[PDB]
Write an enzyme that holds these catalytic residues in place. Structure first.
Site, PDB file in Angstrom:
ATOM      1  CG  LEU A  21     -52.048  -6.758 -65.628  1.00  0.00           C
ATOM      2  CD1 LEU A  21     -53.091  -7.833 -65.320  1.00  0.00           C
ATOM      3  CD2 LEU A  21     -52.531  -5.884 -66.776  1.00  0.00           C
ATOM      4  CB  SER A  23     -45.863  -3.581 -58.602  1.00  0.00           C
ATOM      5  OG  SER A  23     -44.871  -4.332 -57.912  1.00  0.00           O
ATOM      6  N   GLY A  24     -46.831  -3.844 -55.684  1.00  0.00           N
ATOM      7  CA  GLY A  24     -46.730  -3.250 -54.340  1.00  0.00           C
ATOM      8  C   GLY A  24     -46.980  -4.228 -53.204  1.00  0.00           C
ATOM      9  CB  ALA A  25     -48.645  -3.808 -49.913  1.00  0.00           C
ATOM     10  N   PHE A  26     -48.859  -6.689 -52.060  1.00  0.00           N
ATOM     11  CA  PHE A  26     -49.684  -7.564 -52.920  1.00  0.00           C
ATOM     12  C   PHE A  26     -48.740  -8.490 -53.685  1.00  0.00           C
ATOM     13  N   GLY A  27     -47.524  -8.016 -53.944  1.00  0.00           N
ATOM     14  CA  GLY A  27     -46.631  -8.655 -54.896  1.00  0.00           C
ATOM     15  C   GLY A  27     -46.896  -7.935 -56.198  1.00  0.00           C
ATOM     16  CB  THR A  28     -45.670  -7.815 -59.367  1.00  0.00           C
ATOM     17  OG1 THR A  28     -45.347  -8.991 -60.115  1.00  0.00           O
ATOM     18  CG2 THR A  28     -44.506  -7.477 -58.395  1.00  0.00           C
ATOM     19  CE  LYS A  48     -52.532 -12.227 -54.782  1.00  0.00           C
ATOM     20  NZ  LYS A  48     -53.978 -12.324 -54.444  1.00  0.00           N
ATOM     21  CG  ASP A 131     -61.544  -5.497 -48.372  1.00  0.00           C
ATOM     22  OD1 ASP A 131     -61.954  -4.324 -48.213  1.00  0.00           O
ATOM     23  OD2 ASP A 131     -60.403  -5.729 -48.782  1.00  0.00           O
TER      24      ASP A 131
HETATM   25  C1  LIG Z   1     -56.751  -1.751 -60.181  1.00  0.00           C
HETATM   26  C2  LIG Z   1     -56.078  -1.796 -61.510  1.00  0.00           C
HETATM   27  C3  LIG Z   1     -56.430  -2.810 -62.621  1.00  0.00           C
HETATM   28  O1  LIG Z   1     -57.312  -3.636 -62.417  1.00  0.00           O
HETATM   29  N1  LIG Z   1     -55.783  -2.775 -63.800  1.00  0.00           N
HETATM   30  C4  LIG Z   1     -55.986  -3.673 -64.812  1.00  0.00           C
HETATM   31  C5  LIG Z   1     -56.323  -5.020 -64.513  1.00  0.00           C
HETATM   32  C6  LIG Z   1     -56.478  -5.979 -65.527  1.00  0.00           C
HETATM   33  N2  LIG Z   1     -56.853  -7.327 -65.309  1.00  0.00           N
HETATM   34  C7  LIG Z   1     -56.856  -8.046 -64.110  1.00  0.00           C
HETATM   35  N3  LIG Z   1     -57.445  -9.245 -64.136  1.00  0.00           N
HETATM   36  C8  LIG Z   1     -57.500 -10.043 -62.998  1.00  0.00           C
HETATM   37  C9  LIG Z   1     -56.919  -9.605 -61.827  1.00  0.00           C
HETATM   38  C10 LIG Z   1     -56.306  -8.347 -61.846  1.00  0.00           C
HETATM   39  C11 LIG Z   1     -55.664  -7.818 -60.607  1.00  0.00           C
HETATM   40  C12 LIG Z   1     -55.852  -8.287 -59.367  1.00  0.00           C
HETATM   41  N4  LIG Z   1     -55.108  -7.565 -58.540  1.00  0.00           N
HETATM   42  C13 LIG Z   1     -55.004  -7.740 -57.088  1.00  0.00           C
HETATM   43  C14 LIG Z   1     -54.457  -6.648 -59.242  1.00  0.00           C
HETATM   44  C15 LIG Z   1     -53.569  -5.652 -58.846  1.00  0.00           C
HETATM   45  C16 LIG Z   1     -53.024  -4.794 -59.798  1.00  0.00           C
HETATM   46  C17 LIG Z   1     -53.371  -4.955 -61.135  1.00  0.00           C
HETATM   47  C18 LIG Z   1     -54.266  -5.972 -61.466  1.00  0.00           C
HETATM   48  C19 LIG Z   1     -54.794  -6.791 -60.530  1.00  0.00           C
HETATM   49  N5  LIG Z   1     -56.300  -7.610 -62.988  1.00  0.00           N
HETATM   50  C20 LIG Z   1     -56.301  -5.589 -66.875  1.00  0.00           C
HETATM   51  O2  LIG Z   1     -56.493  -6.548 -67.861  1.00  0.00           O
HETATM   52  C21 LIG Z   1     -55.909  -6.215 -69.103  1.00  0.00           C
HETATM   53  C22 LIG Z   1     -55.962  -4.269 -67.201  1.00  0.00           C
HETATM   54  C23 LIG Z   1     -55.788  -3.343 -66.180  1.00  0.00           C
HETATM   55  N6  LIG Z   1     -55.441  -2.011 -66.503  1.00  0.00           N
HETATM   56  C24 LIG Z   1     -54.204  -1.890 -67.320  1.00  0.00           C
HETATM   57  C25 LIG Z   1     -56.597  -1.271 -67.103  1.00  0.00           C
HETATM   58  C26 LIG Z   1     -57.178  -0.403 -65.960  1.00  0.00           C
HETATM   59  N7  LIG Z   1     -56.577   0.961 -65.940  1.00  0.00           N
HETATM   60  C27 LIG Z   1     -57.723   1.792 -66.333  1.00  0.00           C
HETATM   61  C28 LIG Z   1     -56.086   1.106 -64.547  1.00  0.00           C
END
Ligand SMILES: C=CC(=O)Nc1cc(Nc2nccc(-c3cn(C)c4ccccc34)n2)c(OC)cc1N(C)CCN(C)C
Length: 283
Positions: A21, A23-28, A48, A131
């Site tokens: 979903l 990547s980066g400073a966070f891991g993936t 994560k 935050d």
């Molecule tokens: C900021 C980008 C982001 O939230 N993208 C994203 C997330 C999710 N679901 C999800 N659910 C729980 C936690 C997270 C999540 C938490 N962290 C810290 C992330 C970092 C990068 C990507 C995702 C995450 N993400 C998800 O569930 C299918 C889909 C997408 N994207 C592919 C759709 C959003 N797109 C419009 C950027």
């Protein structure tokens, strides 16, 4: 108050990672499925993938509210993994950007209420987030959002004194004295509402963070978003009062936005207007 939360340890075999979903400073962060052992259920999850991740695990395990992120478990592999509830529509900042044209006053004001509820619950657990921002709110459905990112969160002692940090969302006292309280969180709640009301504008767009402290000192603040009646803008401005005890309480923010949410077009003006189980059902 002894913290008797339970930290669940997960075996890696219990879950499939299906796709990346981000990547980066966070891991993936991957999205995946958690199939608890001998259970005939399948839970959609974000996975994560050391001290820092554990501190976050700690805070997250100790919370339980419909508007704050569910920590399901951790897995103790070569690389540690946090497993949480999958929030399929992603982070609210992007959501309002990528749907500017089909967001109504009802959604905006509800998101506002729900974010306050999440925050008031954190106030109840003597917990300061540090935050809050649209980027750190996740969307389960357009009707339902949860607060996230407890990497800076601190348990409580009426303040916290720290040793980058996200400047443009920060209360004045925090910028100048690194003092952070629940009223610091309210200032940040203010900016978060502003992001939502402008459908994801960057605050102080094109302005250096250095000069931010002085700007606020002088008396400047974020402008009134075009869709916002003065009633709503006034609430934002009250969240940005130099004197922290003058800003509202999340408790009161829930009430004011609740009232507004029952007649949304008076407060916001917008031309328009198989074995799967979600984690909220997995106790
Ligand atoms: C900021 C980008 C982001 O939230 N993208 C994203 C997330 C999710 N679901 C999800 N659910 C729980 C936690 C997270 C999540 C938490 N962290 C810290 C992330 C970092 C990068 C990507 C995702 C995450 N993400 C998800 O569930 C299918 C889909 C997408 N994207 C592919 C759709 C959003 N797109 C419009 C950027």
């Amino acid at each position: 108050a002894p913290n008797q939360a339970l930290l669940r340890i997960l075996k890696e075999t219990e879950f499939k990672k299906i796709k990346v979903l981000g990547s980066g400073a966070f891991g993936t962060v991957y999205k995946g499925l958690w199939i608890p052992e001998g259970e005939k259920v399948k839970i959609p999850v974000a996975i994560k993938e050391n001290k820092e991740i554990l501190d976050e695990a700690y805070v997250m395990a100790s919370v339980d509210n419909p508007h704050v992120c569910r920590l399901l478990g951790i897995c103790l592999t070569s690389t540690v993994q946090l497993i949480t509830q999958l929030m399929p529509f992603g982070c609210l900042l992007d959501y309002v950007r990528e749907h500017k044209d089909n967001i109504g006053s009802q959604y905006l004001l509800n998101w506002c209420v729900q974010i306050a509820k999440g925050m008031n619950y954190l106030e109840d657990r003597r917990l300061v987030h540090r935050d809050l921002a649209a980027r750190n709110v996740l969307v389960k459905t357009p009707q339902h959002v949860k607060i996230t990112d407890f990497g800076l969160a601190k348990l409580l002692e009426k303040e916290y004194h720290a040793e980058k940090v996200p400047i443009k969302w920060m209360a004045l006292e925090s910028i100048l004295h690194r003092i952070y309280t629940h009223q610091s969180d309210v200032w940040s709640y203010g900016v978060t509402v502003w992001e939502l009301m402008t459908f994801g504008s960057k605050p102080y767009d094109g302005i250096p963070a250095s000069e931010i402290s002085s700007i606020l000192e002088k008396g400047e603040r974020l402008p009134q978003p075009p869709i916002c009646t003065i009633d709503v803008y006034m609430i934002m401005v009250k969240c940005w009062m130099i004197d922290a005890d003058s800003r509202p309480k999340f408790r009161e923010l829930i009430i004011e936005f609740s009232k507004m949410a029952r007649d949304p077009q008076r407060y916001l003006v917008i031309q328009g207007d198989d074995d799967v189980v979600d984690a909220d059902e997995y106790l």
